[PDB]
Design a protein around this ligand. Structure first.
Ligand SMILES: COc1ccccc1Nc1ncc2cc(-c3ccc(-c4cccc(C)n4)cc3Cl)c(=O)n(C[C@H]3OC[C@H](N)CO3)c2n1
Length: 264
């Protein structure tokens, strides 16, 4: 963390984007390069009890160097405010892109494949994302798909063993929930109170994808959503799943989805 430079001289802060954890996030401009960045500003007086969690997330992001993980550019302390500078992804989140109407299975498979590429990277690095969900999957203006908002080391995407207190297979369960979310718009149990969901996830059989979806997509979901973690496939294995191979296409086609969101 840079304690000498003035981030208000280095960056121009523009409009708020998304909905950041611990602090609001703004579109910003690097005044030296004129590149757009994302800027989170956290008041460290008001967010005192969470400082260790903030530090832990900075450390993890700073150790990641992947096309599939949002890049970390640095942080600055100005008076009581911590500025965190990240890669700007102008397409918004996958969750935002559900708003105009349902995805088709090519779009679902393409987004899942790119998420899987990020999980393959993290798991190979002995890391766990811990909060895979559509709101934490960001798209660039070119359709590139990247992971954001790592979980700290709401229940709807949590694996049963996480709730009951795990390894990288918890991310695979969360991916299965995210696949349902990309197909249906919301995760299982979304109509229920979160305290009820907390006991339902360990108690119940795993969710299935209900509706008129291809059998490969339903089987992709079922494979991720096994109560036994060792029965879930790895991210590497799921990149070869027939649903992915038969349906995923070039990520650049996702710009059509981004444009549809701008037109809605
Ligand atoms: C037009 O663009 C958008 C429109 C709509 C939505 C998103 C964007 N585009 C975007 N592009 C980059 C981001 C980088 C961070 C970001 C992430 C983590 C940290 C960070 C690092 C270390 C420690 C801590 C505590 N935090 C800092 C930042 Cl800067 C960020 O928060 N968002 C907004 C956020 O996206 C995910 C969603 N769940 C809630 O909103 C980001 N949005």
């Amino acid at each position: 963390t840079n304690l000498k430079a003035d981030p208000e001289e280095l960056f121009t802060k523009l409009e708020k984007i998304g909905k950041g954890s611990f602090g609001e996030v703004f579109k910003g401009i690097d005044n030296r390069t004129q590149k757009v960045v994302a800027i989170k500003i956290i008041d460290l007086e008001e967010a005192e009890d969470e400082i260790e969690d903030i530090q832990q997330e900075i450390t993890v992001l700073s150790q990641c160097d992947s096309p599939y993980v949002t890049k970390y550019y640095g942080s600055y302390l100005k008076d009581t405010k911590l500025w965190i500078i990240m890669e700007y992804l102008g397409g918004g989140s996958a969750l935002d892109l559900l708003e105009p109407g349902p995805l088709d299975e090519t779009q679902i498979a393409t987004i899942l494949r790119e998420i899987l590429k990020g999980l393959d990277y993290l798991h190979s690095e002995k890391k766990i994302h811990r909060d895979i969900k559509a709101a934490n999957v960001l798209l660039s203006e070119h359709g590139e798909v990247k992971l954001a908002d790592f979980g700290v080391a709401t229940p709807f995407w949590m694996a049963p063993e996480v709730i009951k207190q795990y390894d990288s297979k918890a991310d695979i369960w969360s991916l299965g929930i995210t696949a349902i979310e990309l197909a249906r718009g919301e995760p299982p149990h979304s109509e229920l109170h979160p305290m009820k969901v907390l006991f339902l996830i360990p108690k119940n059989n795993p969710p299935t994808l209900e509706g008129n979806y291809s059998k490969p997509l339903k089987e992709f979901v079922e494979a991720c959503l096994n109560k036994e973690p060792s029965f879930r496939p790895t991210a590497k294995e799921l990149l070869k799943h027939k649903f992915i191979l038969r349906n995923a296409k070039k990520t650049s086609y996702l710009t059509e989805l981004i444009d549809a969101h701008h037109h809605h």
